[PDB]
Write a protein that binds this ligand. Structure first.
Ligand SMILES: O=c1ccn([C@@H]2O[C@H](COP(=O)(O)OP(=O)(O)O)[C@@H](O)[C@H]2O)c(=O)[nH]1
Length: 419
């Protein structure tokens, strides 16, 4: 069981190159099932889910190869079924459904039983395809969708906002006959990226990033080269890494416009920030951060995925600051871990009240949340002594070699074993 062993305190400073966003890469990879011509997806991070997706795609008859890029040739998809064995570890598997039925007239995806770990409904996906003219067949453990000819554009009102279902509906609609309108569409930067990818293949889509996406169906999608957007949360993580350690950092391969809220929040903390078209710099000038007040909310407001990071910031900032989760519940489980590191805070309902301390102290800590976990590693960097963060496979799943990046920033960190 891998652990990160960190020796602090160390000032995090220098440069880091942001990896492609896993959350844009995934939907884009599935959308490539629509491309009749070879496609080159650049800036794809080396992550578990990417591998699982490549395997799933190969199983379908897709010709797949990888490095920085993932090369895809789906001009010849022959197997319209995603089996239990390959979808078992990945919810995103449902994304194969729509492209299959839209392009080939049929798709089937295996669904983990009710009791399986991480098992969640995909109702929105299925009923969305239905609105598009897909004939649906359901039996415990699988969903099949089919159509005679092209799907039919429809006016679709979403009762629940869903990143997942928005991708499925927007994707399949690029091949349908007519216009499809998605009201209450997810607004995420990853949704905009997915749409941009589709458009790059010849799709007709507008409104991406707003509450209303409009797709005009076309004959077919071609091939080409597309560069996956930078990972906004990863970028936020490294900004905070410099912000809490008096450091200065320049993030390469970034997209400032996907971080308005995070950047303004950092400025409130006394950070000196600069941005370019593809870079972001953060300079603390050796100073301790100032405590901030944070309210998480839907994009493009302050992101809940930056919460644990900002909590940490408050915990070592000058002064008191409150962090409120306005939508999500139970997002503070990891706070007791930080308090074991010498932090001072109180959790009250949907908020964490932070009292900044001078220096944290090393400890053996653990968190199951990717973000919280990463925050633990950051704390280990600036804390006094030795910190051992357990179960870092959680981090490995969403961050591309975070220890390598941290090391280049000046961290005393290492991957160690323990069973
Ligand atoms: O088929 C679906 C897809 C989503 N949701 C709900 O909408 C929320 C947001 O979904 P989204 O796809 O944005 O996130 P994900 O499920 O990918 O974590 C979920 O937590 C569910 O509560 C649902 O009920 N059925």
């Amino acid at each position: 069981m891998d652990k990160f062993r960190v020796q602090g305190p160390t000032r995090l400073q220098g440069e880091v190159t942001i990896s492609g966003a896993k959350n844009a890469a995934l939907p884009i990879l599935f959308a490539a099932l629509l491309a009749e011509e070879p496609v080159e997806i650049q800036n794809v991070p080396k992550l578990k889910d990417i591998d699982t997706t490549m395997k799933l795609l190969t199983q379908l008859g897709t010709k797949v190869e990888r490095x920085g890029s993932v090369w895809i040739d789906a001009s010849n998809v022959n197997n319209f079924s995603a089996p239990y064995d390959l979808v078992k570890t990945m919810r995103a598997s449902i994304w194969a459904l729509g492209p299959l039925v839209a392009r080939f007239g049929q798709g089937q995806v295996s669904l983990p039983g009710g009791d399986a770990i991480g098992a969640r409904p995909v109702d929105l996906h299925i009923f969305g395809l239905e609105k598009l003219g897909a004939e649906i067949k359901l039996e415990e453990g699988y969903v099949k969708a089919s159509v005679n000819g092209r799907l039919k554009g429809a006016h679709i009102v979403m009762d629940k906002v869903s990143v997942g279902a928005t991708v499925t509906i927007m994707s399949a609609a690029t091949l349908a006959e007519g216009t499809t309108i998605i009201e209450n569409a997810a607004r995420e930067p990853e949704i905009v990226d997915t749409a941009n990818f589709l458009v790059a293949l010849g799709a007709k889509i507008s409104g991406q990033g707003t509450d209303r996406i409009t797709i005009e169906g076309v004959e077919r999608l071609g091939g080409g080269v597309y560069r996956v957007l930078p990972d906004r949360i990863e970028t936020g993580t490294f900004l905070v890494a410099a912000a809490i350690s008096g450091g200065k950092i320049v993030c390469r391969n970034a997209q400032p416009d996907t971080l308005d809220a995070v950047l303004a929040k950092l400025r409130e903390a006394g950070a000196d920030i600069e941005t370019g078209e593809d870079w972001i710099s953060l300079d603390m000038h050796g100073k301790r951060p100032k405590a901030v007040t944070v309210r998480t909310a839907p994009h493009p407001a302050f992101p809940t995925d930056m919460q644990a990071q900002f909590t940490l910031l408050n915990l070592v900032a000058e002064g008191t600051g409150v962090i409120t989760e306005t939508i999500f519940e139970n997002r503070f489980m990891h706070v007791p871990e930080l308090i074991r590191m010498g932090a001072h805070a109180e959790i009250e309902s949907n908020t964490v009240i932070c009292h900044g301390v001078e220096k944290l102290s090393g400890a053996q800590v653990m968190a199951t949340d990717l973000r919280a976990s990463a925050s633990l590693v950051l704390a280990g960097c600036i804390a006094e002594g030795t910190t051992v963060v357990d179960r870092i496979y959680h981090i490995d799943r969403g961050y591309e070699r975070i220890e390598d990046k941290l090391r280049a920033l000046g961290a005393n960190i290492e991957r160690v074993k323990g069973e």
